[PDB]
């Protein structure tokens, strides 16, 4: 049996292949393989990911010829080092994460050879910048659903941590499959070299900024900042009046001075203090 | 017992100086 503390380790490398292939053909359900490395009865490690040419419909998506599959795995053994197929994924476009009535069927084909084929859903729409909603699954027997017997024999305080969505609960969870808690394998091998490689620049700051127009832009804000302060020479004057909780609901048609009047003060500061300081270092450094 | 008054109010600055630091660094970290 299982302990519902399965703890699927994935990677740092596979998920970018997951989302790029998932989003380049997003409204169709694209899918692929999961090529990883098995460990003990509890955990599993999926390290590499590749897709195949597919043929789809609106509600269904299929594969094509199996000669693509064996020839791809031969070339990945000879280059790098050999692995084994730990599972498979697919991509609900903007749905969420569940096993539909056809998604459950090819899972049933894959769980026969190895019983631990991990079924993975990636949604490349719901993922904005943070949560990437993924939620890997695996089947449970509908024979034990007939028995009324509750499976998986909880022996660790690790499973019931993330709560399922109600929309995935409308679907087959939890009558034919279960969820798995996952995290990410992170290391200085990779974590240091995506941070210190992505957002970097070279001259954007040792340079000046359109020197006749920066001082011109120092009037393009201040000119309407007069009349915006005239509204601030207006709105305080109608206080000691109708209970300023009313002055929250009422003022939603037009812009207030008070919040907008500290908005430009930050802008009229950092545009000046940066441009003044960066000019006064080139006097020292350059002769 | 003023030497007992000194330890407890040395234990005050022992205990108060960390607290004013403790909410001070929350101020940036909650924003982050």
């Amino acid at each position: 049996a299982v302990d519902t503390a399965e703890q699927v380790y994935i990677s740092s490398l596979a998920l970018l292949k997951m989302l790029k292939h998932g989003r380049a053909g997003v409204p169709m359900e694209v899918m692929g393989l999961m090529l990883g490395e098995f460990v003990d009865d509890y955990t599993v490690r999926v390290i590499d990911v590749f897709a195949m040419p597919q043929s789809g419909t609106g509600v269904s998506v299929e594969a094509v010829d199996p000669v693509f599959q064996a020839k791809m795995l031969d070339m990945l053994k000879q280059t790098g080092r050999p692995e084994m197929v730990v599972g498979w994924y697919h991509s609900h476009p903007g749905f969420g994460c569940w096993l539909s009535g056809v998604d459950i069927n090819t899972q049933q084909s894959f769980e026969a050879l190895s019983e631990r084929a991990v079924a993975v859903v990636v949604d490349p729409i719901q993922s904005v910048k943070g949560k990437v909603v993924i939620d890997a699954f695996r089947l449970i027997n509908a024979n034990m659903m007939v028995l009324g017997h509750e499976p998986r024999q909880t022996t660790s305080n690790l499973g019931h941590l993330n709560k399922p969505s109600i929309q995935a609960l409308i679907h087959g969870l939890n009558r034919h499959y279960y969820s798995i808690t996952i995290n990410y394998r992170k290391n200085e091998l990779e974590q240091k070299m995506l941070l210190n490689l992505h957002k970097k620049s070279w001259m954007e700051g040792l340079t000046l900024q359109d020197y006749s127009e920066h001082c011109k832009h120092n009037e393009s804000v201040v000119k309407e900042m007069l009349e915006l302060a005239k509204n601030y020479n207006k709105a305080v004057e109608e206080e000691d009046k109708m209970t300023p909780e009313q002055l929250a609901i009422k003022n939603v048609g037009k812009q207030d001075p008070k919040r907008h009047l500290e908005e430009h003060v930050d802008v009229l500061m950092t545009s000046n203090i940066v441009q003044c300081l960066a000019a006064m270092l080139d006097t020292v450094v350059f002769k | 017992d003023l030497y007992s008054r000194y330890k407890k109010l040395q234990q005050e600055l022992e205990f108060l100086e960390v607290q004013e630091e403790y909410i001070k660094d929350e101020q940036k970290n909650l924003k982050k």
Binding site: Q7, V39, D40, Y42, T43, K186 | E14, V18, Y22, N29
Partner: protein, 159 residues
């Protein structure tokens, strides 16, 4: 092994350390709590720095997690009530990239200051409770406060 190190707790017996070496180097997941928990129990408050070097040199290259977890409690327990004699290790594990070993560094300062009302602990034991990103280490950080401040139960409900 869990029953064996329990009766031989804090005893520095070489005989229990012999079969706990070969229990440790199995490269196996399921021996993880078997090895590293009892490896600290028999060396409680011993700070035998070669055995620390054996432990922290072992939980950097293994690829299972219970062996990263059982040593995380075991290396905290080899030092006990030291007040200055752990602090280079405390800076070492807190600077490391490993979230478990940063979390393991939180239990070690929790045992190097049992009941001790020192400020030098409470500066950066509780600074990293603010800033660190893993939820595992953040739960270990705030649960180190009663173990260093049970000597006075009056101040702990105030903080």
């Amino acid at each position: 092994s869990l029953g064996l190190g329990l009766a031989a707790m804090g005893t520095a017996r070489q005989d229990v350390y012999d079969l706990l070496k070969t229990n440790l180097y199995q490269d196996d997941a399921v021996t993880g709590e078997a090895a590293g928990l009892a490896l600290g129990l028999v060396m409680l408050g011993s700070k035998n720095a070669q055995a620390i070097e054996d432990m922290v040199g072992y939980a950097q290259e293994t690829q299972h997690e219970k062996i990263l977890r059982g040593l995380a409690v075991g290396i905290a327990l080899v030092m006990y009530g030291r007040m200055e004699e752990a602090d280079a290790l405390i800076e070492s594990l807190c600077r490391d990239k490993d979230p478990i070993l940063r979390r393991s560094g939180m239990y070690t300062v929790a045992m190097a200051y049992c009941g001790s009302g020192n400020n030098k602990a409470i500066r950066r034991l509780l600074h990293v409770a603010v800033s660190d990103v893993n939820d595992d280490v953040r739960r270990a950080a705030v649960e180190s406060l009663g173990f260093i401040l049970f000597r006075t139960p009056e101040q702990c409900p105030s903080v």
